[PDB]
Design a protein around this ligand. Structure first.
Ligand SMILES: *[C@H](O)[C@@H](C[C@@H]1CCNC1=O)NC(=O)[C@H](CC(C)C)NC(=O)[C@@H](NC(=O)OCc1ccccc1)C(C)C
Ligand SMILES: *[C@H](O)[C@@H](C[C@@H]1CCNC1=O)NC(=O)[C@H](CC(C)C)NC(=O)[C@@H](NC(=O)OCc1ccccc1)C(C)C
Lengths: 306, 306
């Protein structure tokens, strides 16, 4: 038993990380087949970033201005183009470590693993959630741009996030691998509002089911509630409204534990109204919302990949 | 900025995981050079585990009774031996993915990454700490035995933990890679006491320094204290006594932030005496003790590996 915030094994993604240099700026790229993907602001000076005209800046660049370095293997750039907020550098060599992969645009509330990288070398791996306001709460320093977020289905890596920027909150924003930002953000050094965040209700419930599976059951109360009744408590505490789609998603956990979803909702409602009274659930004194129902099920059934 | 519980990239360790079968029992092994390492209780039936005579049980086994499977590559076993609580199976093939490695016995309070595995295939990676009572708080199901904990120094993997068992607490116990248990535990299905745990004071302070680096500074109070004065508050709250060795270890963080260690201790003392009053630090409502001073420094300086 036990329950931990667990990332996917990162080996398949490690083999794809490269270093991309244009001028003095160096960031990370993702090398898949014969294309390297990276944030387009690799082409900016520090001053350009205040208000860059990326088309005009890219026109001043040629293939040989982009230095792509894979460990010490170094790649010849034979084409470049800008797709939304990413650059695609065509190289003369296919990555021999390219895994089976897919580019996906994830939904708010979903989770993914991040492989944090600097100069094209991995530093660490951690799990998180795409917030409802399309930010993530990461750990990113200068030079981390181009680090990617991903999920694994057995042998297939689904890339879903590339890091671009940090917002005036210490939160982080980025794009999918077609270069479209999650949320309203633009890749410019100018003040930008994230907007109000909300707690991912279906993930909290999943985590309460995780708790029961692992023996933590003090919060299991006696009451029940209705969707409406719970959704009224939800808006007060800035939780996403629960839908029947969410109830259905929680079906397997409901069946494994014998606790109806609406009964679990009544427990959650009491936790929101009365707090935890200095107790903990799964080692936490806060209600956790960065485990999806799928995350809980894989961790309590032992799903593997390779 | 930002601060996350970050594991090491697991790729170098993924390449070493194999499946070991003896009879009906299947668990994970670690394949390094031409030796596979795994828990010796792979040789037990469910009934043997109540009180196994491992020498007598191993004598009934021959090389061909051990099935070692690496993905679908499958290895010929040409020798076996028992070292403390691990078996060493000699195979006829050196692992072509063997990283530069070392076997280390870590100290209580140190951290390491765990690659959780089933049937020799990785499922997830997460960070944790060797508790002062020589347990870990992991996420482990049936078949996870043989999963390993490790740290990376650039290109060198230091293996420090192999998983063996779960205790009547939901906590976990295991051995170093020479097969010596951390703590008083034995590999038998019989009730076993872990003993009182304590909080890793130097790690809490490191995490408070992390908080200040990332802007969370509300807890920075006005007072100071002495080691003695703080250590008296320490024993009351079941914290490890702080030593001058710990103060010295915290030197770099003290210099980076301009906060004397004893000033930070006075903040910690007030947090222990008065709680957090419903506030949070680095997104947590509890005092966190599973980041070492080194963990904080690598995460706020961007150290990489490969
Ligand atoms: C790539 O290096 C990446 C790393 C940053 C540095 C620290 N944490 C990170 O994630 N970020 C960048 O260099 C960005 C380049 C832009 C997208 C051209 N810039 C930023 O992330 C900057 N943030 C920003 O401009 O967002 C809006 C804003 C907020 C507050 C004040 C002014 C603007 C940050 C370095 C501040
Ligand atoms: C290897 O499969 C490993 C996985 C376990 C299963 C669930 N979580 C885990 O980490 N554990 C084992 O099968 C152990 C084999 C022994 C070491 C021969 N057994 C255990 O971990 C058992 N625990 C145990 O015997 O510890 C002492 C004890 C505690 C409470 C009651 C009785 C004894 C557990 C499966 C209970």
């Amino acid at each position: 038993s036990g329950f931990r915030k667990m990332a996917f094994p990162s080996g398949k993604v490690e083999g794809c990380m490269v270093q991309v240099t244009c001028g003095t700026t160096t960031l990370n790229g993702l090398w898949l087949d014969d294309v390297v993907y990276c944030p387009r602001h690799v082409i900016c000076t520090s001053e350009d970033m205040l208000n860059p005209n990326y088309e005009d800046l890219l026109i001043r660049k040629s293939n040989h201005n982009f230095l792509v370095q894979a460990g010490n293997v170094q790649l010849r750039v034979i084409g470049h183009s800008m797709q939304n907020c990413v650059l695609k550098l065509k190289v003369d060599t296919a990555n021999p470590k390219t895994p089976k992969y897919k580019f996906v645009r994830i939904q708010p509330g979903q989770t993914f693993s991040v492989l944090a990288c600097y100069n094209g070398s991995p530093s660490g791996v951690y799990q998180c959630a795409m917030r409802p306001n399309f930010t993530i709460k990461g750990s990113f320093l200068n030079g981390s741009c181009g680090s990617v977020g991903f999920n694994i289905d057995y042998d297939c890596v689904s890339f879903c996030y590339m890091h671009h920027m940090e917002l005036p909150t210490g939160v982080h924003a980025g794009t999918d691998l077609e270069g479209n930002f999650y949320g309203p953000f633009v890749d410019r050094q100018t003040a930008q509002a994230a907007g109000t965040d909300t707690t991912i209700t279906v993930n909290v419930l999943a985590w309460l089911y995780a708790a029961v599976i692992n023996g933590d059951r003090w919060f299991l109360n006696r009451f029940t509630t209705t969707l409406n009744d719970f959704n009224l408590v939800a808006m007060k505490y800035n939780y996403e409204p629960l839908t029947q789609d969410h109830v259905d998603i929680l079906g397997p956990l409901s069946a494994q534990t014998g606790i109806a979803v609406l009964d679990m909702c009544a427990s959650l409602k009491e936790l929101l109204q009365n707090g935890m009274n200095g107790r903990t659930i799964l080692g936490s004194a806060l209600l956790e919302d960065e485990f999806t129902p799928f995350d809980v099920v894989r961790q309590c059934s032992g799903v593997t990949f390779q």
